[PDB]
Design a protein around this ligand. Structure first.
Ligand SMILES: *[C@H](C)[C@H]1/C(=C/c2[nH]c(/C=C3N=C(/C=C4\NC(=O)C(CC)=C4C)C(C)=C\3CCC(=O)O)c(CCC(=O)O)c2C)NC(=O)[C@@H]1C
Ligand SMILES: *[C@H](C)[C@H]1/C(=C/c2[nH]c(/C=C3N=C(/C=C4\NC(=O)C(CC)=C4C)C(C)=C\3CCC(=O)O)c(CCC(=O)O)c2C)NC(=O)[C@@H]1C
Ligand SMILES: *[C@H](C)[C@H]1/C(=C/c2[nH]c(/C=C3N=C(/C=C4\NC(=O)C(CC)=C4C)C(C)=C\3CCC(=O)O)c(CCC(=O)O)c2C)NC(=O)[C@@H]1C
Ligand SMILES: *[C@H](C)[C@H]1/C(=C/c2[nH]c(/C=C3N=C(/C=C4\NC(=O)C(CC)=C4C)C(C)=C\3CCC(=O)O)c(CCC(=O)O)c2C)NC(=O)[C@@H]1C
Ligand SMILES: *[C@H](C)[C@H]1/C(=C/c2[nH]c(/C=C3N=C(/C=C4\NC(=O)C(CC)=C4C)C(C)=C\3CCC(=O)O)c(CCC(=O)O)c2C)NC(=O)[C@@H]1C
Ligand SMILES: *[C@H](C)[C@H]1/C(=C/c2[nH]c(/C=C3N=C(/C=C4\NC(=O)C(CC)=C4C)C(C)=C\3CCC(=O)O)c(CCC(=O)O)c2C)NC(=O)[C@@H]1C
Ligand SMILES: CC1=C(/C=C/C(C)=C/C=C/C(C)=C/C=C/C=C(C)/C=C/C=C(C)/C=C/C2=C(C)C(=O)CCC2(C)C)C(C)(C)CCC1=O
Lengths: 161, 67, 48, 54, 160, 296, 161, 161, 160, 101, 161
């Protein structure tokens, strides 16, 4: 996977040059964002379970998916959704802390479409739950950290779409 | 092929398995020489105590014809 | 599997795509086809 | 009444970072100190004590 | 990068980054000004650092350049300097990133295979990088010399 | 002859510590032009730069004492550290000592020393021999050198030899500046602490000026150590308020702030019209050579 | 897989007959090839690393392929290319000593184009690598042995492309 | 395994009492020694191969063991001995970092004495090889860290006794 | 021994030896006379073979015995001569056995690690065994030249 | 300006060790010497080893540069390359009786 | 495909927001650049017949490609090459006039990479030819217009990579 710093490193090294002024500027910009990234990551780790709980409450509960026959039926499957939302949130936090959403399409989106197609998961329902998580985390962490987290979560949603 | 026989006691340090476990907690197996180092590294890293080991098959210091 | 269990088909959740790859591996009978289910993982970022 | 006689040779491809062409001049400026050809024939060396024994 | 390494460890344990990892990343991002400055310094001293590094290496082991060695002529010595510039760029990458993963990814995986297919003395390569480190420390601030010497030392250990 | 190398080894064997040390020193002197060139990289010097730096930091008297202790295989920590090393490490360490002596970083040999007859004969044999048996003889000679706990002995100890002139300035004959130069060559900074006034304005090369008599005394006690100053000429002019500006150029025959044994050093003195030495600035003039640079 | 001998054997067996004259002359031709193939295999086993070394030095080495951007950059990718060449050389020797490309197209062409495309491998650079392999093998094995080795390597190249 | 901190914690927990003044003093001692231990680890990681090579050369090379009929004789046994000494160096460095010998007891010493007895490997020779490693590492790291490194290596040799 | 190799294959397959293995052992036992002749010739002419091959190797790669090299010094060139003696005797063992098992077991497994530890250029050693191949082929008969060349080719490829 | 510098061109700031490296000299120019005016007065020129041109130029600095505004002398020691590029430039801040620098 | 103005309009539409100060300033920037782009388009339309000629002459004449075996060999292939370069020139001029890269995204690089790969044509030499025509157009048009043309062209090269 690639972060904001190794992204600049590989961008320079593909042409093989050294680190010029633009590379140093990009690294300094990432270092400036690092404070916000670290604070948001710590808060999200602290409130991970509550965030997914609230998103599930406001996006999935009391609907056809949770009703009998629905994909959220069969409590093993409900726990599977809880774990999946936890995975999405944790890897979104990883991507936000890295500054590049390469881990999202490497360790997360890789095979996700075919997985959900085989398992009959409601893709739009999962996407909607992801925006619910995005809104909850944005409210919890603020405007800028919420901005970055929403960027990466919506990248995940676009990958699902 | 110059195999090794080892008795090792491997406790359980993370999970309380509710079914019978002597067969893998205190066992004496025959290990090939090539895999002995890897097996012993794995056992130590898993935390077992190597009670005993002996070259059951093969001859010590064979400068040739060890297969 | 430990030192006493015969290996069995697994249904891992992680890492990514491992579940679909194992599903494609195990849903086909022996010698069903010669294609490669998972020839390799196309890396998202190419070093150099 | 000048005229531009374009030549056989293709236009020289610009040097890149990976190519050691730009290091060629640096190596020449180095001019590393080589080694004289050793005068050893090994026939008069006898392998009973000439090999180390420590 | 250090952030990438911490993320990988957290993913391996299947958990969020611990407070220790978070504080380490915070300290790294705060102190990144010095790392960028030292990368700039090594980039600027690139030409000289390579020059006297190769000179000291050849003096310490002229067999690599002498008849029979890998880089006997000026042409192959130029290639050797090119490789030394590669490794300088990799150490700069490591300094800016903060972690040795770029170094391992670019110039330490299969390096024994590379320098056994090329016949290059890997011990000679290690000595060349070591002289590189010595000259860089000489022309660098002492504490910052140690900061770059961490990555130079890691490359030396992997080469050896 | 097949037995040339063992015969030369035995011949080096009967020689004493003084003969062995003189022979190895002259071998280093003849090295490259007459003996085998040195390629120190082949030896793992990384486990030896610690002792090399320690010996460089040691003072010249203790430097020669440690060298003779190694030569006669004395029981010292440095001797044991040398002995535990591999023979190639030992030879590379001796070559590093020779390089340090040539560059002035370590206390060199007495001026105009001459080899003994037996050592000269053995060195002529070494020069006649091929490079392979040359290096073999050198390695075998150096291996037994250094103290290893066991059955060993030395017939006679090689004791360290127990054993100053006024500096002459062309165009400058100021008593204060002459006393300054002579007492720095003698390391008489205690005398200099009153030889210059209480201002204590010193200008180390590539550094900002030092302020304070105590600061100047600390600088003299720490940095300046056994410096060999050989000024060439000088010019004196009247500065403001009767101050004397003295620009004196010479050379420093010792490593000094990354300075060579021969370096065009220049001292600019603002000396008090009534006092003595208000400010001193030391500058090592550049040339097609720059190793003390630190970039930024 | 199969070679010429097993090809004649199973061609007879599928019709369920003994060895007719055509099979006898085919076997005689293969036996006549015989010692030439075994000698070429022995010399290749002698200088196994050699042919790949000078083939790389001829075609791939010192180029944009081994430069940044090119797929040969980094020691890992370089050693991967060397390992690929060693695979190709051993399969070429096997196919030579057997007399058929069944070993290759069962152990080479199966999914190889698609896996190299997934890795973004340069098919042209690979083909040039096998070419340089061919000349280096020819210069050490002779004229006819080198020719048949080049034929097998050309089949490998065609399958790769 | 254990470190100094875990050793102190277990020593307190066995009698089930809180960390008293002596435990805090030991923890302070380890915390002070941490910087020195890390620097020594960096040096040994620098010179891992060279330390082993020098130790074997000054300890076993051109001796009885390396000659035909010796345990270190033959390339396979030479490689085995080199690997054993490399692992010894690495695990002694591990113990130096941890401040405790538990890693050596439960990762380097159980199943090794009787393994050497089964293989006929010279314990008296491997002891001297470890001592040569100790001398080389002492010369590299210095007397301060070298003393504790030698303490751990002496522990290894005693356990191997 | 090819007999031991065939026994290993048969026991792995859990079957008695096949006609191929029987014919192989029969041919080996019938050619044992010529194999022993080749072994005796190599043993008799060992010192001249090794010395000529070592000198040809020196001419190929002078840096091996140049100052600062692994073979530098009469000790470190006599050790090359000793290593060449070891490998020649190993080739004799392999010739008399008919298979490469003793060679792989005594000089091929762990050889790269040993030479990495000692700093030796295994490529140079491969050139040396090549030169021993030409020297032995010159001193030896033409018909058995191919047979000895097969084992020399094996060793050169493996240790390359 | 720095094109007059040699590729191995070095700068010697006052009270500081020499700086070697083209981009290093660029950095010195663009973060240390920032909008300062100098008043050179006189100079001397002669040859030097390796074909260099040693030029000692004395002038007055009218801008704050490490202290001593206006009342400090700048000595440019120009070891110029034989081609013409400045192989080494040393800027020495000769000081009046003013102290506390 | 959309110009800079239409891209801004579509962005504001997707956010459901009016053209705020950022949109107005971007549109004013495009309006300022309009005169420059129009004059550059007129000049490049003047010289379009010859510009590719000198670009190829300084790029891909008397090289390996032009000779038989080179992918530019034969009148048919060379005409295809010059037509490809003319396509690049015309569509990059289109992109410069529009002030947006979407035209090249959908009408130029869409499928071009795999098309070249299937055709076997040299992508690296195509990149070099695009670079050469970049310098030619820069010299022909000026500094700022040349810079815009170069950013479009090397974006094309990056897509073609
Ligand atoms: C408890 C009252 C006493 C006691 C017990 C104790 N046992 C262990 C660990 C193990 N016990 C067993 C025993 C069995 N496993 C089986 O499957 C069966 C037969 C079906 C038996 C009898 C085993 C195998 C282990 C080790 C492996 C494991 O637990 O799965 C412990 C823990 C020891 C440790 O720290 O590893 C303890 C405490 N201890 C007492 O003090 C009581 C008298
Ligand atoms: C110099 C310190 C030592 C040395 C060097 C040497 N190298 C080569 C040739 C090559 N080296 C590389 C290595 C790399 N390329 C990469 O991209 C990476 C990571 C960025 C590495 C490590 C390569 C690829 C080559 C081949 C040529 C090329 O780069 O295109 C040579 C010449 C080999 C030849 O046969 O031409 C030499 C001499 N040799 C020594 O002895 C020194 C210790
Ligand atoms: C080198 C000759 C050329 C080249 C290729 C290249 N290959 C890889 C990686 C792999 N190559 C293979 C291929 C095979 N494995 C097999 O077992 C077989 C048959 C025996 C084949 C043909 C595989 C499976 C891999 C990936 C797994 C691995 O590393 O072993 C790379 C690296 C790709 C990467 O993304 O890292 C490259 C570059 N590239 C060139 O430029 C040469 C012409
Ligand atoms: C000579 C042309 C090349 C070379 C050789 C070289 N070898 C050594 C030292 C040793 N060689 C061996 C090898 C073996 N021991 C075995 O048991 C086997 C099979 C029976 C082999 C192949 C060993 C073990 C040693 C260590 C010494 C000892 O045996 O006691 C050296 C000396 C290295 C040094 O500096 O000490 C040399 C020079 N080196 C080259 O560079 C040539 C390519
Ligand atoms: C070298 C100093 C001595 C020596 C080495 C030697 N070792 C073996 C074989 C083995 N060594 C081990 C060692 C370990 N296993 C562990 O888990 C640990 C913890 C790090 C160690 C140190 C093992 C498991 C083996 C057996 C498997 C293998 O060979 O890899 C040999 C081979 C003996 C034989 O083949 O008969 C040798 C030669 N020999 C000496 O003489 C030195 C004193
Ligand atoms: C010239 C720089 C290089 C080159 C050119 C070349 N191209 C082809 C064939 C094709 N080129 C294209 C590309 C396009 N067609 C379009 O409409 C557009 C949209 C913007 C593009 C980019 C296509 C589609 C083809 C295939 C059909 C055709 O014949 O045109 C060839 C011939 C290929 C063949 O096999 O006949 C050539 C020679 N060749 C080089 O070597 C230069 C690097
Ligand atoms: C090529 C090669 C190499 C080999 C390199 C070689 C050959 C290295 C060998 C170098 C040699 C021969 C070094 C000898 C140095 C002698 C010293 C320091 C003695 C000084 C005596 C003093 C100060 C005493 C002075 C005295 C005092 C004080 C008096 O006052 C009066 C008495 C006396 C005069 C005694 C390496 C090993 C590097 C690597 C491998 C490799 O192949």
């Amino acid at each position: 996977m690639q972060d904001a710093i190794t992204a600049v490193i590989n961008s320079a090294d593909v042409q093989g040059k050294y680190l010029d002024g633009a590379a140093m500027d990009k690294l300094k910009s990432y270092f400036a964002s690092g404070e916000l990234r670290v604070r948001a990551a710590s808060v999200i780790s602290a409130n991970a379970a509550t965030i997914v709980k609230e998103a599930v409450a406001k996006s999935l509960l009391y609907s056809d998916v949770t009703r009998p026959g629905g994909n959220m039926y069969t409590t093993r499957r409900y726990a599977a959704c809880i774990r999946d939302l936890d995975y999405y949130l944790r890897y979104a936090t990883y991507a936000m802390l890295a500054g590049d959403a390469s881990i999202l399409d490497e360790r997360v989106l890789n095979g996700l479409k075919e997985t959900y197609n085989s398992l009959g998961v409601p893709i739009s329902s999962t996407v909607q739950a992801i925006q619910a998580i995005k809104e909850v985390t944005a409210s919890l962490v603020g405007a800028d950290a919420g901005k970055e987290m929403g960027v990466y979560l919506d990248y995940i949603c676009s990958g699902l779409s | 092929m110059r195999m090794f026989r080892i008795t090792a006691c491997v406790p359980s340090q993370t999970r309380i398995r509710t079914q019978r476990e002597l067969q893998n907690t205190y066992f004496t197996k025959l290990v090939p020489y090539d895999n002995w180092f890897r097996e012993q590294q794995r056992i130590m890293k898993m935390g077992g105590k190597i009670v005993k080991v002996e070259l059951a098959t093969g001859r010590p210091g064979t400068n040739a014809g060890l297969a | 599997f430990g030192e006493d269990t015969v290996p069995y088909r697994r249904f891992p959740t992680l890492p990514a795509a491992n579940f679909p790859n194992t599903e494609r591996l195990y849903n086909k009978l022996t010698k069903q086809d010669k294609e490669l289910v998972v020839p390799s993982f196309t890396p998202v970022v190419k070093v150099g | 009444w000048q005229n531009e006689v374009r030549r056989f040779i293709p236009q020289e491809k610009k040097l890149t970072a990976g190519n050691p062409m730009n290091f060629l001049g640096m190596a020449r400026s180095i001019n590393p100190a080589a080694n004289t050809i050793p005068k050893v024939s090994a026939q008069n060396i006898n392998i009973e004590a000439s090999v180390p024994r420590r | 990068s250090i952030v990438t390494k911490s993320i990988v460890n957290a993913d391996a344990e299947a958990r969020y980054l611990s407070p220790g990892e978070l504080d380490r990343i915070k300290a790294f991002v705060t102190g990144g000004a010095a790392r960028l400055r030292i990368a700039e310094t090594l980039t600027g001293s690139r030409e000289t650092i390579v020059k006297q590094a190769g000179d000291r290496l050849f003096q310490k082991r002229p067999d690599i350049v002498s008849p029979g060695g890998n880089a006997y002529g000026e042409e192959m010595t130029a290639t050797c300097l090119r490789d030394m510039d590669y490794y300088l760029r990799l150490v700069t990458y490591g300094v800016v990133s903060g972690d040795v993963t770029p170094i391992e990814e670019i110039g330490l995986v299969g390096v024994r295979e590379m320098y056994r297919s090329l016949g290059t003395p890997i011990e000679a390569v290690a000595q060349s990088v070591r002289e590189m480190k010595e000259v860089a420390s000489g022309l660098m601030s002492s504490d910052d010399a140690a900061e770059a010497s961490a990555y130079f030392d890691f490359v030396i250990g992997k080469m050896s | 002859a097949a037995d040339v190398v063992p015969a030369t080894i035995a011949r080096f064997s009967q020689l004493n510590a003084e003969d062995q040390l003189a022979l190895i020193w002259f071998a280093y002197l003849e090295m490259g032009k007459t003996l085998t060139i040195a390629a120190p990289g082949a030896a793992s010097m990384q486990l030896a730069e610690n002792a090399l730096k320690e010996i460089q930091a040691m003072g010249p008297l203790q430097q020669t004492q440690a060298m003779c202790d190694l030569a006669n295989r004395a029981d010292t920590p440095l001797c044991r550290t040398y002995a535990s090393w591999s023979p190639n490490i030992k030879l590379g360490f001796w070559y590093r000592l020779g390089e340090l002596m040539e560059q002035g970083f370590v206390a060199p040999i007495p001026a105009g020393y001459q080899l003994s007859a037996n050592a000269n004969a053995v060195l002529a044999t070494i020069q006649g021999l091929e490079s392979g048996q040359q290096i073999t003889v050198l390695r075998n000679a150096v291996v037994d050198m250094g103290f290893t706990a066991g059955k060993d002995g030395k017939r006679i100890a090689e004791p360290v030899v127990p054993p100053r002139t006024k500096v002459s300035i062309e165009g400058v004959t100021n008593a204060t500046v002459l006393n300054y130069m002579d007492n720095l060559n003698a390391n008489d900074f205690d005398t200099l602490i009153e030889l210059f006034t209480s201002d204590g304005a010193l200008q180390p090369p590539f550094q900002r000026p030092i302020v304070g008599k105590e600061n100047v005394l600390r600088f003299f006690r720490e940095e300046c150590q056994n410096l060999k100053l050989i000024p060439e000429r000088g010019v004196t002019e009247p500065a403001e308020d009767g101050f004397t500006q003295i620009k004196v150029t010479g050379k420093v025959q010792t490593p000094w702030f990354g300075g060579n044994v021969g370096m065009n050093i220049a001292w600019r003195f603002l000396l008090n019209p009534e006092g003595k030495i208000f400010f001193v600035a030391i500058d090592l003039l550049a040339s097609p050579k720059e190793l003390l640079n630190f970039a930024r």
